[PDB]
Every structure is written in structure tokens, then in C-alpha cells.
């Protein structure tokens, strides 16, 4: 499913991401935009053989099992394919574990390079939340 900007903001807010670990909703919408263009089916392969999945591009090297990333962890206890669902619950629950591991949203390279230090509130402007 390809989300609309406001539709995704509302779904993330309902799933408890607004101000989760001090990150306002605009940060999460901004990260989803540059990681996946709001497409839950997005996949991208990394140089090390691991793959990134879903709306927040969660990596199989640490967070999910895809059956093809040797010596990797599955810290979210889920198959990577569950992160491609039109229901964002699994992606959101896994992102909460990632953002709590010590590095905050810096775990998402696109957030650090394209969202951090910008007016992220603009990503939720006009939304009925
Ligand atoms: Na915001
Ligand atoms: Na591979
Ligand atoms: Na980047």
C-alpha cells in the first residue's frame, strides 16, 4: 500500500509514535518519506547481503528474519515479510525497539541526512490529527 502523507501520520499517531522517545510525529513521517516514499512494499538490498524492508526500511542484519542473511539477528522476532503488510503494526512495533537502542532516530540514515535539523512539523501540516 502507498500511503498518503496525512493518512500515514494518522496511522502512526494511533500506533503511539507521536513523541515516542521524544520524536515528534513529523520526524517519523519525514523518515518514511525518504526511506520508502510511503510504500509498505519497498525493499532494497545492502552491500553486505542484508535487505531493508517496508515503510521504515528495517534491516534483516539485525531486526528481522528473511532466511537469507547469514549470521544475522532477528531482534524484533518477526519474518521480514511481515514488515511489507498494508497494516503498519509490525513496522511500528519494531521501530519502537530500534529507536530505544541508544542511537535514537540516527539508526535511519535518511532521517539523519534529510530530516534531522529541518522543520519536520511541515510533514504533518494541514493534517486532521
Ligand atoms: Na512534528
Ligand atoms: Na542477499
Ligand atoms: Na541519505
Query: What span, in angstroms and rounded, lies between the C-alpha atoms of 32 and 120?
Result: 12
Going by DSSP bridges, is the β-strand pair 51-53/43-45 parallel, antiparallel, or unpaired? antiparallel
Q: Grid coordinates in use for 54? A: 517496508
Do 29 and 5 form a contact (C-beta atoms < 8 A)?
yes
Q: Grid coordinates in use for 19? A: 513523541
Give 28 Cα–ligand 1 centroid separation in angstroms: 8
Residue 19 lies inside a defined structural domain of this protein = yes
Residue 105 lies inside a defined structural domain of this protein = yes
Q: Grid coordinates in use for 57? A: 526500511
Give 98 Cα–ligand 3 centroid separation in angstroms: 18
Q: Print the domain residue range for 43.
A: 5-115
Ligand nearest to the CA of 108: 3
Question: Could you say which DSSP state residue 57 is in?
Answer: T
Q: How many structural domains compose the chain?
A: 1
Of residues 2, 4, 1, 5, the one with CA closest to residue 120? 5
Do 13 and 88 form a contact (C-beta atoms < 8 A)?
no
Residue 67 lies inside a defined structural domain of this protein = yes
Query: What span, in angstroms and rounded, lies between the C-alpha atoms of 107 and 87?
Result: 23
Query: What span, in angstroms and rounded, lies between the C-alpha atoms of 37 and 55?
Result: 8
Give 26 Cα–ligand 1 centroid separation in angstroms: 3
Burial of 90 (0-12, 13-18, 19+ CB in 10 A): buried
End-to-end CA distance of the chain: 21
Ligand nearest to the CA of 52: 2
User: Which residues are CB-neighbours of 125 under 8 A, at least 6 positions away?
Assistant: none
Ligand nearest to the CA of 61: 2
Residue 69 lies inside a defined structural domain of this protein = yes
* SS3 of 68-123: CCCCCCCCCCCEHHHHHCCCCHHHHHHHHHHHCCCCHHHHCHHHHHHCCCCCHHHH
Q: In what order do the strands lie in the sheet with 58-59?
A: 43-45, 51-53, 58-59
3-state secondary structure of 50: coil
Residue 127 lies inside a defined structural domain of this protein = no
Q: Grid coordinates in use for 116? A: 534531522
Residue 126 lies inside a defined structural domain of this protein = no
**Residue 40 belongs to domain with CATH number:** 1.10.530.10
Binding residues: 101
Binding residues for substrate: 101
Residue-level length of the chain: 129
Residues known to be catalytic:
35, 52
Give 77 Cα–ligand 3 centroid separation in angstroms: 27
Do 69 and 61 form a contact (C-beta atoms < 8 A)?
yes
Residue 37 lies inside a defined structural domain of this protein = yes
Amino acid at each position: 500500500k502507498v500511503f498518503g502523507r496525512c493518512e500515514l501520520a494518522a496511522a502512526m499517531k494511533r500506533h503511539g509514535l507521536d513523541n515516542y522517545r521524544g520524536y515528534s510525529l513529523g520526524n517519523w513521517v519525514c523518515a518514511a518519506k525518504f526511506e520508502s516514499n510511503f510504500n509498505t512494499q519497498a525493499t532494497n538490498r545492502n552491500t553486505d547481503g542484508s535487505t531493508d524492508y517496508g515503510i521504515l526500511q528495517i534491516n534483516s542484519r539485525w531486526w528481522c528474519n528473511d532466511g537469507r542473511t547469514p549470521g544475522s539477528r532477528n531482534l524484533c522476532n518477526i519474518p521480514c515479510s511481515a514488515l511489507l503488510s498494508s497494516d503498519i503494526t509490525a513496522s511500528v512495533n519494531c521501530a519502537k525497539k530500534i529507536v530505544s537502542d541508544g542511537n535514537g532516530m540516527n539508526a535511519w540514515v535518511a532521517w539523519r541526512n534529510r530530516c534531522k535539523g529541518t522543520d519536520v512539523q511541515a510533514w504533518i501540516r494541514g493534517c486532521r490529527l
